[PDB]
Amino acid sequence: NQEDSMIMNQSSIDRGLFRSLFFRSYMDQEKKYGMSITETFEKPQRTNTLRMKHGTYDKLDDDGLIAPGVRVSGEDVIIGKTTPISSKRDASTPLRSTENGIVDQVLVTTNQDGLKFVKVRVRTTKIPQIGDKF
């Protein structure tokens, strides 16, 4: 506890002492080229272009998304977007490398243009650590 620091009762943290939560959102759209060429929202796999990310696509369903409630890991795909060029480049968006957690809400709407908007949430239980600020 010297030069400003402090000791903590873990057998108390265990009950709910300074137990918290933290929720992160993710954004992406079904971006249009004009000539009715749109990025595809699904689960891409190699074939023609193979310009893809390295994470786990395997967790996502076939609407190019994980349904909320699944345990996300680290660098695994959360957003499945395929880039058509003149096939399967790819512009999929994965989990932030640092983070971990569970999917909270998988929101999908239409923008002012009507482009398949995605809003995924990453629900983590931040617990008192050996060097957290208080």
């Binding site: 057998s11 265990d14 709910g16 569970i102 239980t125």
Partner: protein
């Protein structure tokens, strides 16, 4: 009769107010230490979600569920899950529970520990039955459900101690006190003007006797007279928090002689 002896002052269902004399300061402390953690307890560990909707998240509700005290009587007849040979959990090491609630009522629907169901067969040992301190018979308020808030679960109850996590805490806060009349000089009493004139003389002080100034400093004095109040969770009935405590304090000693002989 024998060595260090007991003086039960008050007896109840969650408090054993007694006095311990002839014991070493250390022997008194080493049990107060043992009672807080190293006593086997059954409390949920692997909480499995089927469908959730509550205002609390998947792992939110899951944390509180392990904190629910369950009957821990014949816990020394069901081994630690780990020590069994099954695929994770079975009757030998675990007694599984479930909880299937839904916000039916137009009003709020309070999930209580009474709503829990012992699915995995108990095989004939008092265990997995929550501690209901409620008048209404409810016991341990889990959450609140409004509309179609459905909480479909699968809660596994394994063995464990508070050294692992306090949810297996067999006790709450054990009271510890000795040498009320400080004739052992165990404390440099703080005062602006006068010591006892500013410091309140303890309850447990009506059991030792006045110092009397016409006496020297008790240089030959040593500490006994251990005034303790044992606050039980109710998971283990009061007496066993003490008994299965003393017993498990001996086991760790007997383990050392055992280790000395393989050596």
């Amino acid at each position: 009769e024998e060595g260090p002896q007991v003086k039960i002052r008050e007896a109840s269902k969650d408090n054993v107010d007694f006095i311990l004399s002839n014991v070493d300061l250390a022997m008194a402390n080493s049990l107060r230490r043992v009672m807080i953690a190293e006593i086997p307890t059954l409390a949920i560990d692997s909480v499995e979600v089927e469908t959730n909707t509550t205002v609390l998240a998947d792992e939110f509700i899951a944390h509180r569920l392990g904190l629910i005290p369950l009957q821990s009587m014949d816990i020394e007849q069901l081994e630690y899950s780990r020590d069994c040979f099954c695929e994770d959990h079975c009757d030998k090491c675990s007694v599984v529970l479930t909880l299937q609630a839904f916000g039916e009522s137009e009003s709020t629907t309070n999930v209580y520990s009474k709503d829990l169901v012992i699915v995995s067969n108990l095989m004939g040992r008092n265990i997995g039955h929550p501690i209901i301190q409620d008048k209404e018979g409810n016991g341990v308020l889990i959450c609140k459900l409004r509309k179609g808030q459905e909480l479909k679960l699968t809660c596994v109850a394994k063995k464990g101690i508070a050294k692992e996590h306090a949810k297996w805490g067999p006790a709450a806060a054990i009271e510890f006190e000795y040498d009320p009349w400080n004739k052992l000089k165990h404390t440099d009493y703080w005062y602006e003007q006068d010591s006892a004139k500013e410091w309140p003389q303890s309850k447990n002080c009506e059991y030792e006797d006045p110092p009397n100034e016409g006496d020297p400093f008790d240089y030959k004095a040593q500490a006994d007279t251990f005034y303790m109040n044992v606050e039980s969770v109710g998971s283990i009935p009061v007496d066993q928090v003490v008994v299965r405590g003393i017993d498990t304090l001996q086991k760790k000693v007997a383990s050392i002689l055992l280790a000395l002989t393989q050596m």
